[PDB]
Amino acid sequence: LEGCETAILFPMRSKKIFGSVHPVRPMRLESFSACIWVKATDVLNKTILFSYGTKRNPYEIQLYLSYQSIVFVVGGEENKLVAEAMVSLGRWTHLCGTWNSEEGLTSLWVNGELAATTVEMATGHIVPEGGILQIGQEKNGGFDETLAFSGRLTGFNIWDSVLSNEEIRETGGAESCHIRGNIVGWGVTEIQPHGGAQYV
Structure with a gap:
């Protein structure tokens, strides 16, 4: 099935390495879940996995x-949820972030x-559509190479709702392949790698 035996490789850090995600449905979100499998080659102070931003708010x-x-x-650089757990370099790791504007509920799995x-993290904020959605780097470039991702990414998905631990665990299970998002779906949504990034 779609997006099953594929990943995206970032060989090195550079000023143009990144990847563009092009969802058909709009990116207007009152609540969402965003998951990704990451295998990091090296981590710095801020190594982007994925980033969504508009011209007024990156x-x-x-x-x-x-x-x-x-x-x-x-919803802004003032809103950071920090999990002191650390990814192991070279080790596939399933990371999910969930958020709901309703009471500012934010979770990191x-x-x-x-x-x-x-x-109370960005309570009442609605994520606006029409922005730029990237993987491995933030917008505008060229880019700041110290922020770029190095390693492998896959199974990037975005749902417009807060999944449950059941659904999240399943997305991190042996059927991760066939569980996709309705906003961003790995294997169907178009992701273009640029600047040396490319599928594997």
């Missing part, structure tokens, strides 16, 4: 890796386990 949605933590941003959570 940090509408972001998931990145830090030296000792994993950071999930929704590592391999189907809740690694962090908080409330």
Whole structure:
């Protein structure tokens, strides 16, 4: 089935390495879940996994890796949920971020386990459509190479609703392949790798 035996490789860090995601449905989100499999080659202070932003706000949605933590941003750089758990370099890891504008509920999951959570994070904010959605780097470039991802990514998915631990664990299970998002679906949604990035 679609997007099953494929990943995207970022060989090195550079000023033009990134990947563009082109969903058919609009990116207007009152609540969402965004998952991705990451195998990091090297991590710096801010290594982007995926990032969504408009011209007025480049940090509408972001998931990145830090030296000792994993950071999930929704609706502005002031809104950071930090999971002090650290990804192992070279090791496939399923990361999900979930968020709901309703009470600012924000959760960060590592391999189907809740690694962090908080409330009142961008409460009442609606993520706007028409922005730029990238993997491995943030928008405008060329780019800042110290932010670029190095390694492998796959199974990038976005649902317009907060999944449950059942559904999240399943997305991180042996059938990760066939579980896709309705906004961004790995294997059907068009993802173009640029600047040296490319499928494997």
